[PDB]
Design a protein around this ligand. Sequence first.
Ligand SMILES: NC(=O)c1ccc[n+]([C@@H]2O[C@H](COP(=O)([O-])OP(=O)(O)OC[C@H]3O[C@@H](n4cnc5c(N)ncnc54)[C@H](O)[C@@H]3O)[C@@H](O)[C@H]2O)c1
Ligand SMILES: NC(=O)c1ccc[n+]([C@@H]2O[C@H](COP(=O)([O-])OP(=O)(O)OC[C@H]3O[C@@H](n4cnc5c(N)ncnc54)[C@H](O)[C@@H]3O)[C@@H](O)[C@H]2O)c1
Ligand SMILES: NC(=O)c1ccc[n+]([C@@H]2O[C@H](COP(=O)([O-])OP(=O)(O)OC[C@H]3O[C@@H](n4cnc5c(N)ncnc54)[C@H](O)[C@@H]3O)[C@@H](O)[C@H]2O)c1
Ligand SMILES: NC(=O)c1ccc[n+]([C@@H]2O[C@H](COP(=O)([O-])OP(=O)(O)OC[C@H]3O[C@@H](n4cnc5c(N)ncnc54)[C@H](O)[C@@H]3O)[C@@H](O)[C@H]2O)c1
Ligand SMILES: O=c1[nH]cnc2c1ncn2[C@@H]1O[C@H](COP(=O)(O)O)[C@@H](O)[C@H]1O
Ligand SMILES: O=c1[nH]cnc2c1ncn2[C@@H]1O[C@H](COP(=O)(O)O)[C@@H](O)[C@H]1O
Ligand SMILES: O=c1[nH]cnc2c1ncn2[C@@H]1O[C@H](COP(=O)(O)O)[C@@H](O)[C@H]1O
Ligand SMILES: O=c1[nH]cnc2c1ncn2[C@@H]1O[C@H](COP(=O)(O)O)[C@@H](O)[C@H]1O
Lengths: 367, 367, 367, 367
Amino acid sequence: YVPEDGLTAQQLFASADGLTYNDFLILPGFIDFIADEVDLTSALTRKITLKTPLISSPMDTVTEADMAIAMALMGGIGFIHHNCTPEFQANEVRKVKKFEQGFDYPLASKDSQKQLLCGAAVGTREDDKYRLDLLTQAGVDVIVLDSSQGNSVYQIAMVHYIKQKYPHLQVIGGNVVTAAQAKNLIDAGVDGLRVGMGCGSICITQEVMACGRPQGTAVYKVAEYARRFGVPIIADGGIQTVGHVVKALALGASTVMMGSLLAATTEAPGEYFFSDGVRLKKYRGMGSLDAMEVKIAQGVSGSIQDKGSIQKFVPYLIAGIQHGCQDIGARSLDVLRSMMYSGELKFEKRTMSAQIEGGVHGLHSYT
Amino acid sequence: YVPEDGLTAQQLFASADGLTYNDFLILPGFIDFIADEVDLTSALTRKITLKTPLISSPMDTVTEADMAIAMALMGGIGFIHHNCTPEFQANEVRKVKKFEQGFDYPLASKDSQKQLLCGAAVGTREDDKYRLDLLTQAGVDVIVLDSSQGNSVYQIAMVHYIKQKYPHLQVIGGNVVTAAQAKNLIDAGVDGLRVGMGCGSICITQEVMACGRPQGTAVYKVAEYARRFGVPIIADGGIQTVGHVVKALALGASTVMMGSLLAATTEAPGEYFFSDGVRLKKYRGMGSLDAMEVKIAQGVSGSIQDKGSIQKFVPYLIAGIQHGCQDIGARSLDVLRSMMYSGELKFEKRTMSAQIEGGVHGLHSYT
Amino acid sequence: YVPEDGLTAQQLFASADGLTYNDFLILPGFIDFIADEVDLTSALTRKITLKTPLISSPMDTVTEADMAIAMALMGGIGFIHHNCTPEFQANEVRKVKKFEQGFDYPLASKDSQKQLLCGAAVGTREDDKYRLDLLTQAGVDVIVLDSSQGNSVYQIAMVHYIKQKYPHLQVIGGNVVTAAQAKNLIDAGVDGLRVGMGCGSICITQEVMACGRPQGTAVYKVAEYARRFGVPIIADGGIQTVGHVVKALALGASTVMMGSLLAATTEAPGEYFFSDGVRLKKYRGMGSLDAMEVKIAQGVSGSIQDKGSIQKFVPYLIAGIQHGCQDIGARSLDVLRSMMYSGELKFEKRTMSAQIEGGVHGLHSYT
Amino acid sequence: YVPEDGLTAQQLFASADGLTYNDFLILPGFIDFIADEVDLTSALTRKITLKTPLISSPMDTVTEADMAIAMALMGGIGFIHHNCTPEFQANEVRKVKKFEQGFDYPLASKDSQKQLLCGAAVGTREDDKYRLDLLTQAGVDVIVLDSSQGNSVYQIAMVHYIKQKYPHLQVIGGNVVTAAQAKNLIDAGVDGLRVGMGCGSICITQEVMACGRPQGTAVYKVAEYARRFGVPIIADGGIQTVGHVVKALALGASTVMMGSLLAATTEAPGEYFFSDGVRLKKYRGMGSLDAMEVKIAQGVSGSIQDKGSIQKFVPYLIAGIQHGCQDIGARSLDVLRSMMYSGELKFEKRTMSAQIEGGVHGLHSYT
Ligand SMILES: NC(=O)c1ccc[n+]([C@@H]2O[C@H](COP(=O)([O-])OP(=O)(O)OC[C@H]3O[C@@H](n4cnc5c(N)ncnc54)[C@H](O)[C@@H]3O)[C@@H](O)[C@H]2O)c1
Ligand SMILES: NC(=O)c1ccc[n+]([C@@H]2O[C@H](COP(=O)([O-])OP(=O)(O)OC[C@H]3O[C@@H](n4cnc5c(N)ncnc54)[C@H](O)[C@@H]3O)[C@@H](O)[C@H]2O)c1
Ligand SMILES: NC(=O)c1ccc[n+]([C@@H]2O[C@H](COP(=O)([O-])OP(=O)(O)OC[C@H]3O[C@@H](n4cnc5c(N)ncnc54)[C@H](O)[C@@H]3O)[C@@H](O)[C@H]2O)c1
Ligand SMILES: NC(=O)c1ccc[n+]([C@@H]2O[C@H](COP(=O)([O-])OP(=O)(O)OC[C@H]3O[C@@H](n4cnc5c(N)ncnc54)[C@H](O)[C@@H]3O)[C@@H](O)[C@H]2O)c1
Ligand SMILES: O=c1[nH]cnc2c1ncn2[C@@H]1O[C@H](COP(=O)(O)O)[C@@H](O)[C@H]1O
Ligand SMILES: O=c1[nH]cnc2c1ncn2[C@@H]1O[C@H](COP(=O)(O)O)[C@@H](O)[C@H]1O
Ligand SMILES: O=c1[nH]cnc2c1ncn2[C@@H]1O[C@H](COP(=O)(O)O)[C@@H](O)[C@H]1O
Ligand SMILES: O=c1[nH]cnc2c1ncn2[C@@H]1O[C@H](COP(=O)(O)O)[C@@H](O)[C@H]1O
């Protein structure tokens, strides 16, 4: 007999401290398989499944056609940003949809016609209807309603309109952090939910508006509620490391969306420049004054260091996730989440001293 | 009559905050002996006892033959690293085993033939069997199975193989942080356990894989479980100070293993170099890309400032431990641990403000 | 009717978090007197009362005869350090005892013969008996047994010896942080207690030996126990501000001892020097290698910025204490402590965010 | 070393469950004296001390002159009831004051003239002033203001009047169960307090008026507050056993007042009668309709079984108290209370199952 060690997820979130990724760890389990055996199949919506849980964010410094093609080939997907004209966006979607490899990718995301999957973002205003018919003529597969606070009559009306006019189109609902928000969007009829508010690397929404939630708590609560109706959720924002990806998936998320991790890659839109002897690319929030152009800024504009190509960077992330799952003792992401919900998966909190101990420390210097 | 002050260890760990060394202190007791009377005899395995609780880590920038000889003479032991050919490792072990002082050390670690004790690390792959054969012909005394997560079918199979083929060899099992992990390795038949995951100074395992545990909690829990079967545990990683050594021993550990504290000594492998006007030596994790050579890095590579010789540095550590035990009121490490388990030893938590108050503060400058 | 706000001291310390001065505040009360009316009379020992609660520390960079004379004139007292020959120490005490003002100070500390009060420190070894003989012929008024851990057979034996040979001499017992330590020294027969271990500005005892206690908790617990026997306690170490003085007095201390606050004044021993364009004086712990001269260092050696004269600095401290007492609504320190013990005085905890809010913030620059 | 067992009184009352005598026990201590050595000296008021803690209640079926003489001879005291004419009451007091033994009692309660001590009860109306002067002419020693709720302007005015006109007379203030009630009466100037409301054996005040407090909690809280001003308190009502007496004294009471325990003794007023083959005496509350004669009844009227003489019954109670103190390890009642306040005395709660286990159980029959 062995006494139990650590906390279940339900106990971990019972004290209501406002935890996020860096505040806890996952305890190791039992290893009886190799890391290359770990299955990463994940549900994007009610009806779309991917071989990898990685999604590119619809930001104008992250995802255009080249990014989307690379993500689809690597086994994820990309959502084209809509900070542009509808004709431009539809042309980007068409470029993705008509790509042909030579004119090996065993994990590529494909539709029935064997074309690459693609997604796009739209707003909740009247002209977005015209945007929408253009995008559907270009052959989009899935739509995300792009908003900081999706629990509104505007977004609900847009969801109803889409469901009426295109009964085949998959729709992902706007950003939520509570079950009460999730309920209205699920009743309106969304096939997926985007979770997170204020946690993004370029975000200042929390400081400016006082509204948001710690991302780990938000992911756990919303996923726990949404699984009751078979609705998968995307964990969006605040991902800085492979460990963060693993933690988000273990807390209930089906997929993970990244802006800053994938910025400054070759496929990202924009030009490379130099400063202080380092190669850089621009990365900015959609709510920064540069992107929008009295108007209130909800994001900043900055730069990221070059990371190389997506087709090199993504396999590193996949291998990291598989090794994390092996250390946990889970041979697939479905098994990981079922162990979490049954209480078999165990967690531990970290003090600030523990977090310092977890990083590099006590060295004169290092690279 | 006096009311009780402070917390017992069991109460200290009851709230499950995820404590490590810097998060608490030990309250003083009653002094009726001098510091030079404090006995530091400690059990390395079921059948090997040392006169000092200090062990050198099997890393390729820490322990080769010179380090191992120095540690054995000072009253500890060293484990030769296996990031090298089996012939090279066996030659290192032979060099340690055939050393003769002149061809005083009252605390030296010796075997029956009166030769210095030595240890070595091996992996869990097929060629490690041949490594084992060579090391056993060189006369090793104890083996550590070297792994980040020892609770696996591979390590269990290797333990069974070693027990079958060399019934006399002492084996220390791979790194664990939970009682459930400890149970499988103890059932397989290990004579000792290495405890710690993610806490090392050169480690990034926690950030990359999301898996680990705060080291103080891990030491307390695993030692409390393992004492039931008479299995001693080594506290491995995260030791930066003599106070950390004392805390680890008071929490239940029998010995303490150090990588970075003993790096940049004369006996450490490698060459001294200069930079920015300071003499330095390389110190790197075994999971860094330099050591291993898609592959995922689990450690970094850095440098440490010169510390002088082991035969000067270790007596400083011994005297520090003895003075800590005197302030606690414990005349031996066995007495210290029995006071801990009986509840006589008392602890107190530290806020961050308390930790700041505990260090140097309020000075213009100091050296 | 008004509901109660805040915590009593007993509730504040019930959760056992390990609080220091910076972790809490005192809530304001009702003002019906001016700040100049606040009485600061305080008990140094069972039989010595001072008009001010301020004491100079027996360190070789803080208190010699000039410091002691200034402190006595301002209404406190100084303890001569014993890092010197007994003849030198006795000469210092004689210089203090024979001082005559002109060869106004309404608060000066005097004895029956109308000479200034003086104190001295001694150790617990055999030659300290001869030191004691010389100091008593020089006319000392009070002795502090100087040790990091006073709960020992050595200190108890020295207390018994002093009580037997000089039944008139007042003795203050070595540094303690628990009631169990306090009990033995009180049974041996001390007239006062020095409280604090590891909290001093130049101290590294906690990091090196793992032994100590947060100073606010230590003061509250030891004073609560010691008042039962009519033994006053000195709060020693970790005082950086007037607010810290006020907090220590409100938690139960009768007097406060300062090393670093009074260092780099004109009366402090040593010479002024310049570096980087600032005038400085040396300030070092008695356990640093410079002071002691294998030996283990328990303190560091540094420098402090010039503060001017004691006869200017101390009145600033007195006025600060009086204004704090006025804001609290206490017209004397005895009344302050009685309000604390009755539960009328109320406290509140501070998060780290609250502590940041409490300091200077949100400025481009300031002086 | 031994861990602490049980709860201190402060911890016992921290959960606010509303405990009374039967809800807890006292844990045994260490015996190093015989039961006959136990000192039972107790303070009745600021200025009257008795050799025994037992008081007779001022009820018209309990205390008249014969009861008062017997109690004084046995070492307690009796308060004459005032449900009668002032001339009758004064005659009773005169009878007590002029008694002479023969016209051995080593514990008898005496005044300076060597006459037996006596007490009397008065109300808070205008004619009570005339009652009071008559009683003072008869030579009363102490007065209790007799009321169910003493925290009123009427009782405060009567206390002021008594203090003005008879500065030598000791006054005990009306029944209270809270510190807020106690404060007003202490400010008015009482020398003692009567504690208890609704707990008496013949009382229905709680059922009729919804106002009261469990007696054990009331005794602890009021005594803890009143000791700060040197005011002793009487525990009044709800005493059925010697164990209850011991518990009340251990919780802080200085004396204990009994109505029903002393009813149906030879000295009690009234006539013996028979019914159903048992000898009985009447015992009724002062608030029952029979005693008062729309009027609301606050007590009932009943009967008690004959107990014999006071001079036999009281020594049994004294011996029981002494044996309880011996089992506790307290050689006097002052020592018992000091052990309680220091935390050395330890208590334990009882479930209902534990209370059943504590009585007689599992027998066919018994006598
Ligand atoms: N996830 C986050 O925390 C976060 C925070 C800030 C910004 N962002 C991103 O930046 C961009 C800005 O988002 P946003 O919320 O400011 O844009 P939005 O268009 O959703 O909201 C702007 C404002 O217009 C209002 N509005 C929207 N549709 C309306 C309609 N049909 N009729 C009337 N009023 C209407 C909204 O209620 C809101 O006050 C998006 O790409 C968003 O995803 C995200
Ligand atoms: N203590 C720590 O937290 C920590 C963390 C990282 C690395 N390290 C150290 O760095 C080095 C690297 O350790 P590691 O765990 O990466 O090495 P490892 O060889 O134990 O593990 C590497 C991978 O190979 C697999 N593997 C091992 N033996 C196998 C077998 N027989 N058949 C199939 N698969 C097998 C493992 O399951 C794992 O996925 C070691 O020296 C280790 O001690 C320590
Ligand atoms: N308050 C603090 O936290 C703190 C910490 C470190 C140093 N200090 C100060 O620095 C100085 C050094 O203090 P310390 O405790 O190192 O000095 P100490 O002389 O009290 O202790 C030194 C060592 O000698 C031992 N010792 C003392 N008297 C002895 C005797 N008669 N026989 C045998 N052994 C004996 C002690 O037990 C201890 O191991 C003092 O001035 C002290 O106040 C204070
Ligand atoms: N201890 C108990 O729980 C308890 C309960 C009920 C009765 N008793 C006893 O029974 C008897 C009845 O007590 P009681 O409280 O009913 O009697 P009381 O005379 O104290 O009170 C009767 C009523 O008269 C009022 N009153 C008293 N003095 C007054 C004044 N000067 N002017 C105006 N109003 C005035 C009171 O406020 C109350 O409403 C007493 O002997 C008492 O000790 C005790
Ligand atoms: O301007 C902005 N203000 C606040 N949040 C934004 C903004 N732009 C994008 N976001 C969110 O931040 C996410 C990316 O955050 P990151 O991965 O942490 O860089 C996006 O997917 C959006 O949900
Ligand atoms: O590359 C690595 N990644 C993570 N942990 C390592 C690595 N190499 C060694 N370790 C562990 O870290 C310990 C030393 O840590 P340190 O004493 O804190 O420097 C070793 O004994 C190993 O257990
Ligand atoms: O060398 C040392 N090591 C640790 N504590 C010391 C040392 N020297 C003095 N102290 C303590 O520190 C106090 C002064 O601390 P400060 O006021 O915070 O500067 C003294 O009164 C001593 O109790
Ligand atoms: O009529 C009444 N109603 C309520 N309480 C009474 C009454 N008469 C006396 N008491 C109280 O009950 C106490 C006696 O209670 P007993 O010892 O439990 O019988 C007296 O000392 C009074 O405080």
